[PDB]
Amino acid sequence: LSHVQQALAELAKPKDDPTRKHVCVQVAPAVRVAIAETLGLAPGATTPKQLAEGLRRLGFDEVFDTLFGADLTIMEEGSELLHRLTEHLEAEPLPMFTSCCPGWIAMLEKSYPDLIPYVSSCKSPQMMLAAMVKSYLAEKKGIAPKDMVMVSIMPCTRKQSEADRDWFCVDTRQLDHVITTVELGNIFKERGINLAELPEGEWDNPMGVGSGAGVLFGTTGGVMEAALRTAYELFTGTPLPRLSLSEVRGMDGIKETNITMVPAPGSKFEELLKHRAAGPLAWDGGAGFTSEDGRGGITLRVAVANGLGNAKKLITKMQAGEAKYDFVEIMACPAGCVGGGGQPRSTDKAITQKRQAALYNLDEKSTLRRSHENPSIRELYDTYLGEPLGHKAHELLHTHYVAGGV
């Protein structure tokens, strides 16, 4: 039976059933926006509350959002990034690649197993939250990990294989079932439940306490952006706004961005570039700059690759030493994450932009919020995690790759 069907089996069992376990589900914002199309509506018509209300009525016990898991990823990946930078200034190498996309990791495991140490060891948002709920939440609520079943709604089919990774176990799964937008939307229609006719429900807090999804009001700008932001703000001491990715002439689908990082006055980072100055991909040393006064800095070269067929033409440019970058994010979708194979198919060649724009409201877009300001995240990183890249973090928040694929 399909993993989706397996979820429906447990859901069919009564809440007070002796063999019924706790079925928690985590949805992604990219799904919440396109889920409306599955009902024949406009992208973004369905509210996050309506979705949660519908899911809870499907038989689920706890409804969480991937945003909470992403908040953790931003912290871990950001810390690993900062680590890679600081260590290079002191004298895991560079460049550093983002690991969220399951399509990208498969390529570095089967096609380019020489870039393994170049990619982050941090796990994906959903895989982080799934591990967190089956541990911290399990212990806090007082439930055995075997009595907890978790489902996730992802806009990509490749996400199931991601959660199907052998070593992704607890302490036989961190994530048991993954359902796509198209499938979820069909289930709603099959049961006769229209999300457009549902009231404003509510989300569950992965912390076990408090009302809400555990996410504060405000966008992060994305995993890569928020990670870079966290590192930048700690390295420079100055706030970082939204990054405007510009397309690279010669490479379609490839966007780059240069971030001028200046060491904060009175920090170890400032002393690094003052006390000293001077793999298949050998770091060029970083694009640095200085002034005639003695104070300079370094500009971080970030690049985003959209598509697996785009990575092939990008890596070859880096191997030749033509395209010099420090941080590169590789996506397995045509544009962002709102255009995965698990997403609905409407008559529009540019339906991706609509979903991307309807991802957040005008207020949410204007209100910037980082993961290091989240009380829930702060608490988790205190009562259970202890510190980023720590023991527990390396256990459930980090992972490894396999040379040859899974």
Binding site: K110, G309, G339, G341, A350
Partner: protein
């Protein structure tokens, strides 16, 4: 070139230009396929070469070994000759 596009809903033998990728012609005619990038991004839009001949240069990891087996990126590939090509099937290349 008349290409027999195999779909879950049957087949669609439409006319595909030699200068235009089958992907565009498919949806423009009336078929269930994901169209947005075209520059070879997602592998979900990879067709299956059942017979005939197709031409692809800039693609993903599915190179000649896969092409000769029946794997082609219809977003950046066109039929060099009339033939039958499957559409929805990204699992056969994993």
């Amino acid at each position: 070139y008349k290409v027999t596009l195999k779909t879950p809903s049957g087949d669609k033998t439409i006319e595909c230009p030699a200068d235009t990728y089958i992907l565009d012609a498919a949806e423009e005619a009336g078929l269930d396929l994901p169209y947005s990038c075209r520059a070879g991004a997602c592998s979900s839009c990879a067709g299956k070469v059942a017979a005939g001949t197709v031409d692809q240069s800039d693609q993903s990891f599915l190179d000649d070994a896969q092409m000769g087996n029946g794997f082609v990126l219809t977003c950046v590939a066109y039929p060099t000759s009339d033939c039958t090509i499957q559409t929805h099937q990204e699992e056969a290349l994993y």
